[PDB]
Design a protein around this ligand. Structure first.
Ligand SMILES: C=CCO[C@]1(C(=O)O)C[C@@H](O[C@]2(C(=O)O)C[C@@H](O)[C@@H](O)[C@@H]([C@H](O)CO[C@]3(C(=O)O)C[C@@H](O)[C@@H](O)[C@@H]([C@H](O)CO)O3)O2)[C@@H](O)[C@@H]([C@H](O)CO)O1
Ligand SMILES: [Mg+2]
Ligand SMILES: [Mg+2]
Ligand SMILES: [Zn+2]
Lengths: 220, 218
């Protein structure tokens, strides 16, 4: 199975530097070109760079938008792809994806980015990292509950319910920024016969602050 | 410089209908020698990574349903979806790879469905928030259509506009509805000065406001 996993995203100050990594497995790494692609919140995909395969001598190419500022490289012993980013600006804030690119030397060659990682988020800002407060949402046939994840920075946070075992009937609302702090909420709807007789808990993570929270929703 | 543009920017279609979206490049993407157009289509559903749908302009990736069809040549390309399904909600990007790689701006596909009234839930501030001097009141408005909706907050019967933050979910991939969350944030001091807290939703499915409320003495 082909796997691509980005890491290294986070908060960085304007003019600062950051290096992203992309761990790969499930294929012959050195046979493939690799690309980095980014996507600012709410905006289109933007291709940034690729590095060719062994046959092509691992040469690199860049979009004009990042050339001279970003450096793509690879380590063929541990099968990693890297993106070194310098003199960062607000416009560089985005989710960065690594994608397996072409192998033109293959009999099964076709031209496309066929596998993509989950992406790693980068925020270029001078604002301080702030952990979220997590508050339960309980009412004053079906019953709706929620969690309020308030006052954190930067994005993102992840929210699950009952460790992911509750997934249907879940709505997690996009975070909204106000006064340099993000707030989001998540609702979950379950049969009334199952709450509060069964436990309902929201699991919230804020990687930038290594925050991990479990908040049980209790009648009240 | 190969510039990619797409049309339309967005559209909405009922389940079962045909969808047509367009992609243009500023120069030909055709390699006349190999007879291949270096143009691919990618599907990105809400909160997901992009997924390869079509390459060489017309070849479906393995596992992609046959209702998706890519066509065109040179500078003009089309992605057609016959009998759209609810799950097809996504942004579709085209991308040239004839000269490095360039993505188009994307086309946002949404689904038309029957109007649906929102289910409204209101939630008082938690004691865990109150302990630190804040008081957020939350209203969920779930599973409605169309997306157009207005929420009014009232305190002791008077509207409060300041301190409200609203968020909409992307369209639901199952039922093709929308949901919205409205949070009114007060200080504990202010919260304790009043009794009645109400959120009022205005939606075309009702001639009257859709209202949920609570009093601080319950
Ligand atoms: C003889 C094979 C030609 O293509 C390859 C090869 O099969 O080894 C791969 C080709 O790949 C890349 C590249 O830059 O590495 C990436 C791929 O996705 C494409 O973007 C191709 C381009 O389409 C190639 O375009 C060019 C070229 O730069 O070679 C320039 C075009 O204006 C046109 O002349 C085409 C020509 O029609 C191709 O027949 O070539 O590029 C690339 O690695 C080439 C290598 O340049 C050949 O010397 O090899
Ligand atoms: Mg729902
Ligand atoms: Mg007042
Ligand atoms: Zn070059």
């Amino acid at each position: 199975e082909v796997k691509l996993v980005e890491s290294g995203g986070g908060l960085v100050q304007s003019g600062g530097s950051l290096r992203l990594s992309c761990a790969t497995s499930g294929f012959t790494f050195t046979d493939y070109y690799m690309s980095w692609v980014r996507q600012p919140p709410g905006k289109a995909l933007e291709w940034l760079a690729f590095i060719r395969n062994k046959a092509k001598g691992y040469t690199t190419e860049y979009s004009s938008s990042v050339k001279g500022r970003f450096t793509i490289s690879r380590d063929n012993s541990q099968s990693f792809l890297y993106l070194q980013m310098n003199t960062l600006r607000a416009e560089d804030s985005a989710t960065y994806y690594c994608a397996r690119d072409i192998n033109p030397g293959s009999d099964g060659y076709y031209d496309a980015l066929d596998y993509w990682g989950q992406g790693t988020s980068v925020t270029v800002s001078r604002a301080k990292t702030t952990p979220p407060s997590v508050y339960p949402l309980a009412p004053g046939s079906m019953v709706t509950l929620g969690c309020l994840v308030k006052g954190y920075f930067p994005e993102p946070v992840t929210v699950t319910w009952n460790s992911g075992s509750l997934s249907s009937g879940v709505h997690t609302f996009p975070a909204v920024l106000q006064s340099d702090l993000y707030t989001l909420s998540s609702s979950v709807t379950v049969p009334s016969s199952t709450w509060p007789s069964e436990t309902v808990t929201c699991n919230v993570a804020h990687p930038a602050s290594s925050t991990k929270v479990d908040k049980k929703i209790v009648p009240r | 410089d190969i510039v990619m543009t797409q049309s339309p920017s967005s559209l909405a279609v009922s389940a079962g209908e045909k969808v047509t979206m367009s992609c243009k490049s500023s120069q030909s993407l055709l390699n006349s020698r190999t007879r291949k157009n270096y143009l691919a289509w990618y599907q990105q559903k809400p909160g997901q990574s992009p997924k390869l749908l079509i390459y060489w302009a017309s070849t479906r990736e393995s596992g992609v349903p046959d209702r998706f069809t890519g066509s065109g040549s040179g500078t003009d390309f089309t992605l057609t979806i016959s009998s759209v399904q609810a799950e097809d909600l996504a942004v579709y990007y085209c991308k040239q790879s004839y000269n490095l790689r360039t993505f188009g701006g994307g086309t946002k596909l949404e689904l038309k469905r029957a109007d649906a009234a929102p289910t409204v839930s209101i939630f008082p501030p938690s004691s865990e928030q109150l302990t630190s001097g804040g008081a957020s009141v939350v209203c969920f408005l779930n599973n409605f259509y169309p997306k157009s909706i207005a929420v009014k907050w009232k305190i002791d019967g008077s509207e409060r506009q300041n301190g409200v933050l609203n968020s909409w979910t992307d369209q639901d991939k199952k039922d093709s509805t929308y949901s919205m969350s409205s949070t009114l944030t007060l200080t504990k001091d202010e919260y304790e000065r009043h009794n009645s807290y109400t959120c009022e939703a205005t939606h075309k499915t009702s001639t009257s406001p859709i209202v949920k409320s609570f009093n601080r003495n319950e």
